[PDB]
Design a protein around this ligand. Structure first.
Ligand SMILES: N[C@@H](CCC(=O)N[C@@H](CSCc1ccc([N+](=O)[O-])cc1)C(=O)NCC(=O)O)C(=O)O
Ligand SMILES: N[C@@H](CCC(=O)N[C@@H](CSCc1ccc([N+](=O)[O-])cc1)C(=O)NCC(=O)O)C(=O)O
Ligand code: NA
Ligand code: NA
Ligand code: NA
Lengths: 217, 217
């Protein structure tokens, strides 16, 4: 089976786990646990980081037969090619690439404040940035079924993930964008996704690592 | 003709400018100038930022007919798909996706230090992290003619750009890695590339924007 290596949190592997369940992949998780504060012991991962035959050792990683991958986006793309979840036309391909890279910039905007020791002083300023972020995503989606067009694509998993994270931090953030509320519902009720979610191996939380000031659980 | 919008520096646009040149694309640059300290006035861009039809307005952007793109990586892939500059085997596509994402993370590691007011204090530690980064690139390349196989790829433009920046910062950083030196010469030897590098267009500098501690001139 395939091995998904990541920390015992949601973070960067969540859209991957989401994809791995929708696609019917057989896979298992190599969970790395992090030591409690203050030292946040990473030695469980650091001890085998350079022992896995990874070109650029990192988390998350994925092993599939002869293929050993890092970089979360590269893994998503790998799973997508094996299981018909890329864009076909040039129009979808452009939308995929722009949204894939944009999701990561949007995720890091948010990660950078929650992981900041000064999160509480920076929290009101970031909360007022969120309406325009979400509005970009609502205008991009428009009247489409999925973000790339008619068909489910791997970027939809990225989009659901980053939107989920923002709406956990700010439960009212999608309220003036009904088309994104309908997107999240439609995604959560695919069927392999509903089954995964209302199952025990669905990792609700923590959203982030232990040293984060929010969503560390 | 295609329109490439960026600041009047090297920055994130550099690999796009090379690929545009190498593919013989018909292109013009919309160059935005930024004010001097202390304001670093951005009005030349903010004047138009939201009036260009961009889904996620940003720099660099590319306007090609009806297609209006942002995200430097999406722009590179858009150009590559027009000229078959992407991998064809599943092994090549894996090497492309991993290196594309790795090159941005490595670029960002460097950009963060140079733009940090505390640059001088951070410089010693960052210098000692460079040998390990280059070793990983060196062993990834191996004896291959290019990073993805025997066929030039857009990710080669990214790897040249990021490696060029690190060797501009630390001139001895490729010394103990001969295969990376051969990669850089062979890349510069490309006829359309050398001709672009030999004309007073070539913005090898400034690496970064005016407010950077290093590479601002
Ligand atoms: N660009 C890479 C990022 C890889 C990465 O940063 N992994 C970190 C995650 S914690 C830092 C982190 C937390 C949360 C976010 N985020 O935006 O959600 C980003 C980075 C790690 O655990 N180990 C890397 C190592 O061995 O040095 C990817 O997308 O896979
Ligand atoms: N992920 C996007 C990043 C786009 C971006 O941040 N552009 C900045 C570049 S300056 C900040 C910057 C400098 C250098 C790097 N780098 O890695 O070298 C990254 C970001 C800008 O000028 N305007 C965006 C805006 O108007 O909001 C991409 O790759 O295109
Ligand atoms: Na499908
Ligand atoms: Na404006
Ligand atoms: Na080589």
């Amino acid at each position: 089976p395939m091995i998904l290596g990541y920390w015992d949190i949601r973070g960067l592997a969540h859209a991957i786990r989401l994809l791995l369940e929708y696609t019917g992949s057989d896979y298992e998780e190599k969970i790395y646990s992090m030591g409690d504060a203050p030292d946040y012991d990473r030695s469980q991962w650091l001890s085998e980081k350079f022992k896995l035959g990874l070109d650029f050792p990192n988390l998350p990683y994925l092993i599939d037969g002869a293929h050993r991958l890092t970089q979360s986006n590269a893994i998503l793309r790998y799973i997508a090619r094996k299981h018909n979840l890329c864009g076909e036309t040039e129009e979808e391909k452009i939308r995929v690439d722009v949204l894939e890279n944009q999701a990561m910039d949007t995720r890091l905007d948010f990660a950078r404040v929650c992981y900041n020791p000064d999160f509480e002083k920076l929290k009101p300023g970031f909360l007022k940035e969120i309406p325009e972020k979400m509005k970009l995503f609502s205008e991009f989606l428009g009247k489409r079924t999925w973000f790339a067009g008619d068909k489910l694509n791997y970027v939809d998993f990225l989009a659901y993930d980053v939107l989920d994270v923002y709406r956990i931090f700010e439960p009212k953030c999608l309220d003036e964008f009904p088309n994104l509320k309908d997107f999240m519902s439609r995604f959560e009720g695919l069927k392999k996704i509903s089954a995964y979610m209302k199952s025990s191996r669905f990792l609700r939380s923590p959203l982030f690592l232990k040293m984060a000031m929010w969503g560390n659980k």
